[PDB]
Amino acid sequence: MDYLFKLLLIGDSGVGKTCVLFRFSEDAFNSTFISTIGIDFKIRTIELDGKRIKLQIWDTAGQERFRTITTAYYRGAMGIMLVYDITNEKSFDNIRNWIRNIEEHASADVEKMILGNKCDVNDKRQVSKERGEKLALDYGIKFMETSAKANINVENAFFTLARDIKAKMDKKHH
Ligand SMILES: Nc1nc2c(ncn2[C@@H]2O[C@H](COP(=O)(O)OP(=O)(O)O)[C@@H](O)[C@H]2O)c(=O)[nH]1
Ligand SMILES: [Mg+2]
């Protein structure tokens, strides 16, 4: 590895944070060959500008011990994926509360991206792509609609976030 990026997945329970992680890291969706129970992080190494970037992606937003989130939770975090479910408007409304939680407790500056997950389920869509784009735009954050199930824009999301982290990091130094 040339770079090591600590990414966090945050968002309401049931939006598909764990499925996004295991789709990206294992190319699996609710498979029997994996256990997604009590997995705090997954590692995937990608290539940007010919360099090996090791992504340590954390999925700890759901579990009890971090239902009260403190400054300690976001320590070392270089990227955050804010995940909502396009079929659940309540999960989308709570993205503002998750952003406030980052703005208040994150000590260091961090690259952020909003994922509208479950974009394969169009018939149940409660949040238009336009409303997701307008929210992300209001906060100066990047936006994608993903599907952990259909494998839509999962690689694209993590490669785009990693690119934005690397670009910031490379500019600081040269
Ligand atoms: N249709 C569809 N279902 C999904 C997708 N991602 C996750 N799910 C389902 O949504 C539920 C919640 O997923 P999970 O990863 O446990 O959400 P988490 O609580 O944020 O970790 C599960 O039953 C998944 O099968 C997706 O992209 N499309
Ligand atoms: Mg989960």
Residue numbers in the entry: 5 to 178
Question: What do the authors say?
Answer:
Upon attachment to their target membranes, Rab GTPases act as molecular switches that are activated by a GEF that catalyzes the exchange of the bound guanosine-5′-diphosphate (GDP) for the more abundant guanosine-5′-triphosphate (GTP). Once active, the GTP-bound Rab can interact with specific effector proteins which mediate a variety of downstream functions including binding to cargoes, enabling vesicle formation and promoting vesicle fusion to target membranes. Rabs are inactivated by GAPs that promote the hydrolysis of GTP to GDP and the inactive Rab is then relocalized to the cytosol. Structural analysis of Rab8A revealed that the PINK1-regulated Ser111 site lies within a short stretch of amino acids within the C-terminal region termed the RabSF3 motif.
To understand the mechanism by which Ser111 phosphorylation impacts on its interactions with its GEF, GAP and LRRK2, we solved the structure of pSer111-Rab8A. Phosphorylated Rab8A exhibits a typical small GTPase fold with highly flexible Switch regions in the GDP-bound form, and well-defined structured Switch regions in the GppNHp-bound form. The pSer111 residue is located C-terminal of helix α3 in a loop above the Switch II region (α2). The superimposed structures of pSer111-Rab8A and WT-Rab8A showed that the phosphorylation at Ser111 does not impact the overall structure of Rab8A. Interestingly, the formation of a new intramolecular interaction between the phosphate group and the side chain of Arg79 at the C-terminal end of Switch II is striking in the structure of pSer111-Rab8A:GDP. Consistent with this possibility, the Rab8A:Rabin8 structure has recently been analyzed using molecular dynamics simulation revealing a salt-bridge interaction between residue Asp187 of Rabin8 with Arg79 that lies within the Switch II domain of Rab8A. This is consistent with the observation that an intramolecular H-bond is created by the presence of the phosphate at Ser111 with the side chain of Arg79. Ser111 is located opposite a negative surface patch of Rabin8 in proximity to Asp187. Thus addition of a negative charge at Ser111 either by S111E or pSer111 disrupts the interaction between Asp187 of Rabin8 and Arg79 of the Rab8A. Strikingly, we found that the ability of LRRK2 [G2019S] to phosphorylate pSer111-Rab8A:GDP was disrupted (compared with WT-Rab8A:GDP) and a similar reduction was determined for pSer111-Rab8A:GppNHp (compared with WT-Rab8A:GppNHp).
